[PDB]
């Protein structure tokens, strides 16, 4: 992949996870930041999801309660490069077991 390319598609994947994280209206109390280009989520027990790029690499990482994921864009989708798992059922598992509350964006 193109250094290029990356920012193209991660560019589309931060706009994707802010909006979904803003138009959030579930009953849990979810928070997204932006700094220095990493989203912190925070959750109201005070746990945190955060995303971040990797721009050598071109991935996206994800650093939840429960572990680290690293990813590759492979088919027009974010696929972790140890599970094949996708970006966006990893991070809403994630989410919902940290939020205590279902968190899709389906």
Known sequence: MNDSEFHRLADQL???IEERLD?????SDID???????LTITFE???????NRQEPLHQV?????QGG????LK???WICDRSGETFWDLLEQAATQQAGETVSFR
Do not use: M, P, Q, R
């Open 14 to 16: 931060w706009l994707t």
């Open 23 to 27: 138009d959030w209206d579930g009953d």
């Open 32 to 38: 997204c930041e932006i700094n220095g280009g990493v």
């Open 45 to 51: 027990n005070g746990s945190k999801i955060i995303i």
């Open 61 to 65: 990482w994800l650093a939840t309660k």
């Open 69 to 72: 994921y690293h990813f590759d």
């Open 75 to 77: 088919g027009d989708e």
